[PDB]
Structure formats: C-alpha cells, structure tokens
Homo-oligomer: A and B are copies of this chain.
Amino acid sequence: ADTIVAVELDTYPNTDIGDPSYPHIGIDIKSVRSKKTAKWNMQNGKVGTAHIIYNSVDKRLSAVVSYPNADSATVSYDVDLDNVLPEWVRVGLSASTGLYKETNTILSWSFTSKLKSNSTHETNALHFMFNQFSKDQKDLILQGDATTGTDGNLELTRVSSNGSPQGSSVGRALFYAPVHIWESSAVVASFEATFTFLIKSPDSHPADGIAFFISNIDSSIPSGSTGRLLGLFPDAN
C-alpha cells in the first residue's frame, strides 16, 4: 500500500465517507477522510491557484486556494511529516472523475524543498517550475489518463477532442526526481508547492477534484481509485 500525504480540492460531496455537503479543501494523511477540511466555493470555468506550505519548525501543513476577486479557502493541520512519510518521496498532482465529471486542467506547477543541516550548517535544495507543458515532458511521470501538450497544459483526466471531460477517469503527474523531504541532521526542513488549475463542468454537478500529493517514490494509481478516491487511495478507510 502506498504512503500518501495530500491536499485535496474536493468538488463533489461524498457524505457517506466523511465529506461535508459542499465543495471543500482538505488535508489527507494516509486516508481520503480528510483530517481537516474547509468550505471552498470552486468557480466553474475559472483559473484558480493553490499554495501549499510546510516547515519542520511549526510542523503545520497549510493550503490556500483562491480565485481572482474572491475570498480564499485555507486549511491547516499539525503533523510531523518525519513520522508519516519516508525520507525520500515523489511529489505529484492527481485528479479523478466518477459518474460526474470536470476538466482537471493544470496551467502551471512549481515546487521547492529545502534541508538546512546541523552536522554542517549547509543547505540541500530542489526547485522546479512549469508555466508551459510540452507534448513530451520528460521530467514528468504521467500515470493513468494524464496527458500534456494540449495548449501547453497538463490534462490530468480524459477530455474529448471538442474539449468534453469523460467520467470514470483517473490520472497523475509526478516530478521525475525523488525529493529528500526530511532529514534527522536538518535544523529546518521546508517545502512549498503552487499550481494553477481550470475545473470546467457541463453538469451543474462537477466531480471529483484535484490533489497535490507526496508519496513513496514508486507510488502508482491504486486499482479502482476513480471517483471519490482521487487516484490517491485504494479504499475510503
């Protein structure tokens, strides 16, 4: 079983597995049942922005999602990620559709991790930034339905030629390089992630959402993780 830490942008209320009634953002530690959620007024057809942040000093994982000219949704959770994740991980974006559907379009993605040592008092750092995605993006591991190059975007879930999202769809993009996320010898470990997204539905009911996630480096899409499981979890436990 993969080890997963995620921020979910959850557009569809699965009230039988702990979702609230409304679209929401959440912090998932090893379960689709968010440890903490906040209400989120997803805006259909509009470009949004997620900022995620962590440091080893506060051990607080925080996410902010916003649209131009709207109040933000933010959620926070105290978690020592040295006790949850392995030392080496991969970072990625995940999305799914079920019975109901939406485009899961990423327009940009950027990430920064830092280790600042006690042993030496010197820093190890990874930073990547995509504002365009190309038809053949060799620093990305695309899983399931995920594709790149259509209008320089990353389409996480399946979309027809006229541009209609398909249901029962799942897809993920991971950064090729493993990331050293925590280290005993570090005085401060920090990571930042930012992405922009276009979730468009023809339905008045979009599903299922987008997640930024951290996994074991060999993470793959769990079997039957379309719909409410967001390509992250094998089950709703």
Q: Which residue of B is nearest A176, CB measured?
A: B177
Q: What is the predominant secondary structure among interface residues of chain A facing chain B?
A: strand
- Are A177 and B177 within 8 A (Cβ)? yes
> Which of B60, B122, B177, B178 is within 8 Å of A132, CB to CB?
B122
- Are A120 and B177 within 8 A (Cβ)? no
Q: Which residue of B is nearest A119, CB measured?
A: B69
- Are B60 and A139 within 8 A (Cβ)? no
State whether the Cβ of A62 lies closer than 8 Å to any Cβ in chain B. yes
> Which of B66, B122, B124 is within 8 Å of A121, CB to CB?
B66
Query: Closest 9 A-B residue pairs measured CB to CB?
Result: A122-B131, A177-B177, A138-B178, A125-B129, A57-B62, A127-B127, A176-B177, A66-B187, A88-B138
Given contacts A53-B58, A66-B187, A119-B132, 12 further A-B contacts (CB under 8 A): A49-B121, A51-B57, A68-B119, A68-B120, A69-B119, A72-B118, A115-B132, A117-B132, A124-B131, A126-B139, A175-B177, A176-B177
